[model samples]
Target chain A: EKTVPRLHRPSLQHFREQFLVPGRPVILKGVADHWPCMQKWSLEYIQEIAGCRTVPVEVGSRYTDEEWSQTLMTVNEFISKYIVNEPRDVGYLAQHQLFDQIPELKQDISIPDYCSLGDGEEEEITINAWFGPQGTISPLHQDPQQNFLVQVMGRKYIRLYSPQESGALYPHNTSQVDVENPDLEKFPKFAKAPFLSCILSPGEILFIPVKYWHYVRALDLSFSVSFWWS
Target chain B: GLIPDVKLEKTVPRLHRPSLQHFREQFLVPGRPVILKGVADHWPCMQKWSLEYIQEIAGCRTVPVEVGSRYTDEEWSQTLMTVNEFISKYIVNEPRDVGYLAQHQLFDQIPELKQDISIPDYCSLGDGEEEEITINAWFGPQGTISPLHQDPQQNFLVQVMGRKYIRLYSPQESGALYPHNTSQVDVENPDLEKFPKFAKAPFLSCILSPGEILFIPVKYWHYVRALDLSFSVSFWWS
Candidate 1:
């Protein structure tokens, strides 16, 4: 019954040793409050700025699904067909460095001060945009880099288990076990694995340490940005 | 612990035997690292040196051991331990931290142990009536890393036992490899953001095996990693 500990802005040195070096997950409130996207970002705003721009979209129920696939389409077409249209296959322009594709959108966001915690002299951060309607899921999965997820318009239900929970957690497309109501007999080992939960609202960011297993499901039509660092 | 990310890496070529002139003309003078076979074939260390044997011979002799994965790690530090004590904790039994017996004169400390190894005669090719050979021992368990560094003198990395994953970069590729951090960038899992240009640096690497010798050129960048409990002797020359 653990929850991702939420904190106000902490010092850069404080964040590095406490979080980055030792690798811990926590929720940082107000880190993204200053992002222009907090106020300027929306389905309508994105369609207006990047409407005609072609982008890569993942069209699948889940990456683990055999039918999972990808395609390229204009932002407006994707928005209307996937987000606006009532009935359609799941489509997410997820994990794309959209800011690089359309610098106009990047102007509305500022790289978080927390990204400077890395040891690299010119430490760079990789930013990605996730746009999808409610029900879009990233599946339970792990990554090689530390992550900072900031929601701009909608809320998301996030769950995370430690890297030490690996053997018990198994693997996913995201993964098969639905953390909400995982079947006990089929995934009995998962029952013993403890995890932290978060109902990430707009203007907040979640720090996911490297290799932490996480699952995400947007509660509403959502637009979130993620920053990955060393 | 991880694979390298550079694009210019080619497998370092292997010559069946060491012909100082041919090797000198093609690799030595050109400043390249090449693994020469048949060089240490006659050395007694090829068949005699082992963790068990070393502990029996030099058990009481005290030597320095490097604690932590590599010199660059903030947690890394050096300590002196007896040959038997080092073998018991580091070599015989794997510890939480990797303990390495690196860059030591185990030969001069005892003198008798030098008889078990071979010195590549070509070390004399260097002009100057005689430049002293700087012999160093690199002994460690698998996973020990000799973080990316360059040598001022040419090195013949002679493998007496076990194996190592060695990488070499050209002097021309120095710009891509950010050395300002005291060569801490993991050449194996390099952070592209900090040392992005390293992706373009050309390299030649090899899994050096027992009984082989790798000739590392002077000022040439090299990264060494153990793939197994390794015992290697390095002779540096002017």
Candidate 2:
């Protein structure tokens, strides 16, 4: 398949005309080449190279102490409970912790990259790595900011739709829809809306514009990286 | 009195303590007097009053046929359809503040409910500016769904007919819930791992049926879906 571009072309009138009017969302396929980490990125490499380094951990609440604990858990274990509100403190899993267990992987090195703000200044980026025997899934939702989802070592599938389709999709008010078991009958209109679908493979990256509704499921046990930058 | 046009008096026996306690704990704990099940005892009066009063006294008109498609109008089959612009102008033309409505005798019958009530005064105004309360009724048919998200106002959601499910989460669960961009939290797509803390938060789950009411606290994350043809009224305060 032809590689897709990652950046929304600055001057693509076709993009604006086609996507803006009907409020459609598009995928810019090949932007991972712009980042330095993609060339040598791998889960083991990240563990061997940047594992021991401390990274800012974003924890949703004070209750999840394990998320910030020094001990690191495997990606598979993380997904089982962590994916469904498991009280996670996401940041860098320890490098020394990994090296001690797998010395042979020492040569592997993957550097974390940060997105630069246009002012010639760079901000620290919060990174999370998804790797496990089974794929990860992100439920249907809209983003509040721009996102660059990069596929590192595995394949991930993404389903996207526009915001106006909310009536048809029947998005829950923040106070109601349960994370699990979304009622199809109540939201039958969601069945009518068309969506943009794509499966991302290793070294591939995709851009999701702000507020576009999206649902993602891992095609297989895969590894992926996402950079959320404006 | 419009001769009590239609009475939907409840025939079910009084609720057991445990059931009533469960109802109060689950639906009324939010400090709002939205008791869905208990309210049904008087539904006959409410339904009859709403239909005839809005029609005869309020001169309440339905939304226009075009905009009507957007709304799940339960009475659509029996009544003549009016444009939403028409409905918007006459029925919902002005902001109906609850605080002011309290003085009306028609609204007074329900008693000055206070328990679990979300006082509109506590709501945060967009620019830190406070506005009066606004309440409206939405009657939807099957396939209607309120999208995923959160709001600043407290909701007194009453299910008068049919069914609807409610999902709740907490702000602390933002990661798992995957709130929207920094600008605001999106009720949709919450990353599981990144937001694991959400599962730890207390989630209140319930299905609202005829005569049932639920008090949805302000800023609580939620999602809703109308299971079938449903008639519901939500009082948005503060």
Candidate 3:
């Protein structure tokens, strides 16, 4: 029942002291309002710039499901198949390093100053693009470094659990968790874990602390970029 | 003489729990100081480490106390006292001189507190031997200074309570920092008349807040002062 804290354009010092140092997740509003992608990152614009380029898209309901698999296809084909036509199942362009391959797309967004707090230089920052249709689900997972999940278009619902609640989350390993729907009989402890939830919209960035468990579900046709830094 | 064109950046780099490989390749191999934010956020000590709480748990334990503004000063002296006495005499009440519980293995004496924190994953980047890492505690009132010095082992300084102002100089700037011996330095306030080149040394500085951990590479010169009543735990590993 917990809710993710919301911040309105916090200073670098406040961000570091209140959330970064404390390992708390927060939804930062208006921080990315000025990104060029906010206005120009329409489905047509993306298909225009890199439709010929191939991308890896996840097919099926969820990666955790046995039927789910990955395939490489052109962006134009992906849009036509999944967005333009009735999708047979959810197709997601998840965790693709689009910015690394396309220099023009990289110019559309800017790295927030808070990322500089890490030891890595700007060149070392890892930027990934996630584009997908509504109903796409990224089952609960964790990552090794700090993440700035920046929303460029559309909305998404996110739920987060602190690392201390790992026991209750029933971790499959160090990285993945069964957070979306836990079996009450098997994972009785899951109900004991408290979580924070949020709805991320365009021009908003969510700061996810290292190793924090998170589950993501797209609320609408969506385009998002993530910056990972150590 | 100072290294040509060498200067420390104005701010230290801060990050969350980075992978061990990234930690080795980015900061360890380069011998740089980085401030790791949120690494100690989950530590039970973060919430339960108030003065009264510490006194309640480890008051009877004996600890080394440093009495003076700076350990490098002539008035400096050290003694052993119970944590309870140290807290009441120095921390709660205004003292004639600053009192510090410096460089003590308090975790060994009070093992209960050790359960609150975890050994960071990067500490295992070296050989996996558990004994290779050494953990120490530094607790003190405001204004207590460690002066500028270097350590023999790599250190992850974790702040549990209060804040600290830290200044670090690279090993390349050793000539300018003027190391007096292997560990100590004349850096509290160096005499510009005698050591004019000291000003030429480049250094990085940051305010270490509770729940933040700072990485200090082996032999890197560092100066620390408590900006407020503080408690810190440092992990030293090969």
Candidate 4:
């Protein structure tokens, strides 16, 4: 069941001391056991529990709420409405209220106003379920805060590079690291970047550090729960 | 003197509404750049990236190219060849699609990233936006490095190559960082005491190897040097 090897929890102490403490990112092998779904999560199980729940849909035109009565049907419908016709400019998966119905699968993470720091007391969380069909890809971009992602059923392919390697990343014309439409000619430094790749499977979780540049791709019909609190 | 405001919206008709306003506020400000530091690197995906086989399969797309003042088709071909060879030797040879990545379930694959960190939705690829993804490799020799400059969009930079020296400061310190109007500051040196804000903005000198990654806030003044022949990959989103 475990394709990618797992790392011992205690052994990570050394990594933490040697690498993590110094502000370098480490990829631990086995850290996804904390979630309850790992033990008993499956498509059928989700159907039995919250198959009747409906969620919101972002159709690129309007933000409308849609119900997920059948995980397969609703999710597919979402792909057609939101994923298929998604625009590059529109961010924040609209109609996020759909995931609120699930007990173990909802988060309250909110986006911060300024990139510097979050409001001291007024912190909110945004949690949602992401399911992508084979060939669905999330563009390469960076977020302001830190992130924690969990895979309940299926797999994903993620590639990460340090922010210091920005030259190789060939940022967009703006100051922000925008690789959405990078001009290879203008930013040729990206040609020599060293990349880290991981294929996340079921019952596994990945932690992406704050502001670290990452590019994510869906390996299959994948479903996962992600939490971002910072 | 500042270049007359061209307004991205007017110059580039491809600009989106929500993103245009957001980009204006975050990156296009007069001269202030944001740099974040001390982010953790304990995600599983980061770890797997170091493995030789993983490098072999997914490593081809992210090889660094030389974009020097010399611009020619021959140079581009040579760079592409070098990238292909690097991939065949170091990374895997499998052509992976998006569905394959999704099935892995990012949250479960690397639970550590899901921790208290909040995921910033700076830009996503949902719209019919065909984002430009470059698989870059940096082979910076002893003195090879980048001068100071600003990028177009929010970036997701990954290190898939060697190692380099990286430093950053706010754009407000442009005077201190010493922007050269002649060739545009190829290298930035900020007077720390002269501009105390430079001190407040902590500098992260990371020794990034194969799997490790970092996030540089938008328009942050940064400089890099090839500690060795450094290689990495960067994906940008508008």
Candidate 5:
């Protein structure tokens, strides 16, 4: 296992040269420390603001399992059933475009200045929200563009593999990989790939390069917002 | 006087030829650096760029030469010499002083070589206007150093031969990087005692290999050292 590097208030140029240019992953400390969401995005605040809103959630231990499926439920029902109460199964509000669905929440966090380097208009940026209970897992997957995964509350264990290790990860297509338990006979090459792992804490942002495979597990009731560009 | 805690990144990001929209969103808009591969694979320079070819084509061309390990040193100096003279004395054989063909608009003089490479499509992603792009050439031997500096325009530094190790700090890091002036920094073995805050400046590092294009945003602080005998071309665009 490789260790993901961490930076403290790095300049935009420093971030571009060291990480963006090389497709490397880094944990940026203090990047989101000042965001209003860092203090305001509590379970109670979320339940108060958009509790009755309908949202899709993942049900089961992992999305890769056959029994796992997606279902739409109200945010309040989701909070009580999965977040506050003991879970029968892990319930996750994964990859929901929360900023768009609940525009007020968008005001709580700023689109980092570094994102302005993209030629695309600011309106085109994609902001995703991930909130879940402890033990929630997102089976390893890859995204098409660069991402800034900002943790607002709780902690998460994240593991990343470079895109060059696609062969080792045995991607089913472009999106998902069975990183937790690969069929050794089917994907023997997976053992050869090196990976970086980190525990993401609240107020930090993890930069995930495009097409880099990542697996995430919540250590507590976790809430994260991700900004995807290009 | 160093800061209590500081860290640096270990590696750089590499990407295939991403779309203009993708490049802008990921690297450009974010003010991040990326090494783009396969973008210059079709250039004739990838296949035909050799010391012998350059000597034959631009042998007598008078070019400005950097005459020391780095321009920041007291012993540093500059001269104008023929390409053949520069190559034989510095690149082809061991030399008393490092010689560099740096930031020279060699393309305007050697149109034949210029025909080999094209302006990458991603350069046009800025402002959607036809802007004048400046092309510069940097040919040097192993151990040549370009001390930390910043430029006003975005750059696509394409490596044609050998390897170079580059470190970059963002414009936002200016407070820590401590620019001596607009162009230079005291980064080469910086005096930690004098510039203690420099330790807190986070930076990214990369070893650029042949055929790799590193996108450097405007005013990004960069320091370059040749890891091997190297040749590079830089395109500066808005």
Candidate 6:
């Protein structure tokens, strides 16, 4: 459970030698310090920009939870009902490609130079916006594309496992296994599976290698952006 | 609801893992701090957890570490650092500042690590399901002190590794505790001139060790100091 390796704005060559080419995950810190989103993307700011524009949100603790469901609501409603209220139930505007739909907000973040090292096209790169209240969960799952997950508003706790450990990580419907509130009896294999973890803070970007198993949970009301390049 | 026998009960009451029904009637609802033994012997942490082991697992993870002798200190402040850096600097190499990872709901944040332990069956006495059990990690070096403080709910501080010097005062003793930040040493040996009423306040003290569970009743003013490189878990559910 040691923390993920952290570096501050590493050059493309150094990043590749240590982590990228090796297919290991590392946290890129102080790289997003200059992004407009770092300072200007608070809930109030998001509300003013597109408060009435409706977007789909994942409702409930997580996709695996029995209560999990989805709904469409304006950004303002999501904030007022979930983000600004005492956390009882969780909702998230997660994995939505909002930048393409609302290009007005796309100017806030700058694409990391590390993403350019990918074989995928700059235009083909997929970007997702993850905005949620405290306790939002992304259960243990893997993505096909390498990801540079950038934190903008608050913070999150992320656990990563190698693709080889999928036997343990995906033992169940990994989506149904709540990593946060663990079920040791039913998911005993997960305990034996070794992994790395990090608490991603604002302005820090965690690089997730393609298909690396990850379980994410927000520590506070958080907004993060992910750039995925296959 | 027996009071601490001033003539005899010099230590916290000890039992060998009392059942939920027995604990509820005997000590849980009795409003006293009791030491339940062998309660945490089943945890894998009892065998596998150590400074090196903790450092290896989730050691690179950044966590909020509080610096200074105690929270009430004027210079005390909290900052985020890698778990290794904190363990290396504060736990391994002692400093003027005492670093305490106090009451972090770590199991919730750092999820993968949650599989190593279980919630005590006794907690179900409080209908723990209706309310969530807040599982927090308390990690620090020998000198780390948590000043005289009290939590609002049911707290069972289970020692997973190392040990701590724990002292408890009652709701009746609240007035004399002075809202307060008297250090562990100061509390252990009272200074009559500074805190005249401290000596008069009755307390139940103990050296909480691995496999020992200290059930702290609600509103109990408690003072704690780590006696070694300690790692403890506290479960709270009102």
TM-scores of the first chain across all predictions?
Answer: 0.92, 0.57, 0.94, 0.63, 0.92, 0.92
Error of 3 at B110 (Å): 69
Question: How accurate locally is residue A95 in candidate 2, as Cα lDDT from 0 to 100?
Answer: 16
Question: Candidate 6 DockQ score?
Answer: 0.02
Lowest lDDT 10-residue stretch of candidate 1 chain B: B1-10
**Mind giving the per-residue lDDT tens digits that candidate 3 earns over A1-230?**
68898889999899999999889999898889889999989987776567766799988745355858889998888998988797886789999899876766787899898997778888888899999998788887788989999998899999998999887876653324456666778878777778899998999999999888888899999999999987
Local accuracy of candidate 2 as per-residue lDDT tens digits, A1-230: 22233443433465545543334555544444445455665545443333333332222312234423433454334443343344343322211233223322222323223233212223333334444333344556765555556676657767776676666765542212222345677665665566677777766656566677766666755556554444
Tens-place lDDT per residue, model 6, A104-141, is 57978878888888887799988899998887888788
- Candidate 6 runs further than 4 Å off: A1-230, B1-9, B71-73, B94-96, B128-131, B180-185
Candidate 6 lDDT score at position B174:
74
Where does the lowest 10-residue lDDT sum fall in candidate 1 chain A?
A115-124
C-alpha lDDT of residue B152 in model 5: 86
Native contacts retained by candidate 4: 0.00
Note the DockQ of each predicted structure.
0.00, 0.00, 0.01, 0.01, 0.00, 0.02
In angstroms, give how far residue B150 of model 2 lies from its true place: 74
Which residue pairs in candidate 1 collide? A139-A174, A140-A174, A172-A175
TM for every model, in the order presented, reads 0.48, 0.32, 0.48, 0.35, 0.48, 0.49
Q: Per-residue alpha-carbon lDDT of model 6 for B1-238, expressed as tens digits?
A: 1122234436888899788778898877878788988878778888877777676555645679997656356757888876767877787754655788877877776565677777887887885583488899999877777877778888889898877878888877777776642433356556678777777778888888898889999888788878777899998876
lDDT of 2 at B1: 7
What's candidate 5's DockQ score?
0.00
Tens digits of per-residue lDDT for model 1 on B21-112?
A: 88778877788788888878669988888776776556656789987655456767888867766877887754776789999999887566
Pick the winner on TM-score between candidates 2 and 4.
4
lDDT of 5 by residue, B120-205 (tens): 88988876444488899999988788888889889999999988888888898888866653334456577788778887788888
CA error at residue A135 for candidate 6, angstroms: 37
Error of 1 at A156 (Å): 91
Any runs in candidate 2 off by more than 4 Å, and if so which?
A1-24, A33-36, A50-128, A173-182, B1-238
